[PDB]
Design a binder for this molecule. Structure first.
Ligand code: CL
Ligand code: CL
Ligand code: CL
Ligand code: CL
Ligand code: CL
Ligand code: CL
Ligand code: CL
Ligand code: CL
Ligand code: RH3
Ligand code: RH3
Ligand code: RH3
Ligand code: RH3
Ligand code: RH3
Ligand code: RH3
Ligand code: RH3
Ligand code: RH3
Lengths: 121, 121, 121, 121
């Protein structure tokens, strides 16, 4: 649990997700994206399942990054929702939703969707 | 921005979402689902845009709930991703993602997608 | 099942969705968006469950619109995926996905997600 | 356009998507999934952009499969929404929504989301 997820992961875009698993389920750390209106690190927070199953299933988790730091504000936030798989090629497989603040008139087009896969190399 | 988010919020299912918005952009609270493999409050955390634009744009935000508490463990996690719209009929408009831990053969079906709209009611 | 789907349907944006449901499970028609880079009818096609269960369950269905007609080309496509619920206040409840053609560097942001609920109005 | 997309593709699960691009934008063919309540082929229909851009961007497309054939009915339908990329390693990169028919009471959990990548080998 804690041991697996805690640390540095990298997705297929080159972004760098540096997280610490609390013992109770807390997720805390930072996020630097390779693309988008984004530069340097951003704060992130979320949760994972701290007593996950033994049947060889992944560990369900989820975190969120609001795209504002000491450099820029993108008026957006994405949530990654996924599950952590251990073993030889450990991965965190996710899908995500990026909502950016709009007027009610562009609400229809406020949310992008996607998938990021995170490995340790 | 920080008063308008903070407090109790109810989605279209009857779920109760109690959240505190810090001044940095941090979200903390509890979520209680009306539906699903859930009962009582579950801890939540998220992030939001503490400097949203001043143009009638909503305020982007995310948060996560891992469906484990003292009472049960659904081995799953939801992230909600949307925007907050203040004023007379303030709402929090989300789309969400729920991943449950599955086996590798079952990963293709591990994730539900939906939308929740929250009102102060 | 085939009468209840066929006809004119309006989402929460004012868009008009004219569809014919064949007896095999086929959907044909036109879609006219109230929003976006669109104007006049666009051709649509989809599929539905022509033997939905008899247990109060809705009727699964999908359809696609490529945003090219005689008038303009947004180089993009939406699929709607939901269920039809008959009776007094019949609705078609969708979530949708809109992909626009992008470059490879831009693929991560090529896809919008949303929901549309259709009423006979 | 037509030339690229028309034919046989395979996703990362082993499913077999056999499609024909109309000259106007029509998509027609069959779908055999490796997983899920699915056996043999199912009819599919959809649309792609028939005059796509020249700037090296993908071709936006979308299709739908209702999971009923002469063998079984899964009371579900998925829509794939994505874009076709030509060149050496041609791919159709998609995300999808599988909605299954539910009572209004399980509507919240009626729709799964995912991503399939289709290549020619
Ligand atoms: Cl279990
Ligand atoms: Cl993967
Ligand atoms: Cl600002
Ligand atoms: Cl809405
Ligand atoms: Cl049946
Ligand atoms: Cl709804
Ligand atoms: Cl162009
Ligand atoms: Cl890919
Ligand atoms: Rh258990
Ligand atoms: Rh991929
Ligand atoms: Rh600004
Ligand atoms: Rh809504
Ligand atoms: Rh049946
Ligand atoms: Rh709704
Ligand atoms: Rh053009
Ligand atoms: Rh993948």
């Amino acid at each position: 649990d804690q041991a697996g997820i805690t640390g540095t992961w990298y997705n297929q875009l080159g972004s760098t997700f540096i997280v610490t698993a609390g013992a109770d389920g807390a997720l805390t750390g930072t996020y630097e994206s390779a693309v988008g209106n984004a530069e340097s690190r951003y704060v992130l927070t979320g949760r994972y399942d701290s007593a996950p199953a033994t049947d060889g299933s992944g560990t369900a988790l989820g975190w969120t990054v609001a795209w504002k730091n000491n450099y820029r504000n993108a008026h957006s936030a994405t949530t990654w929702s996924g599950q952590y798989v251990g073993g030889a090629e450990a991965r965190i497989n996710t899908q995500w939703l990026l909502t950016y603040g709009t007027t009610e008139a562009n609400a229809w087009e406020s949310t992008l969707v996607g998938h990021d896969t995170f490995t340790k190399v």
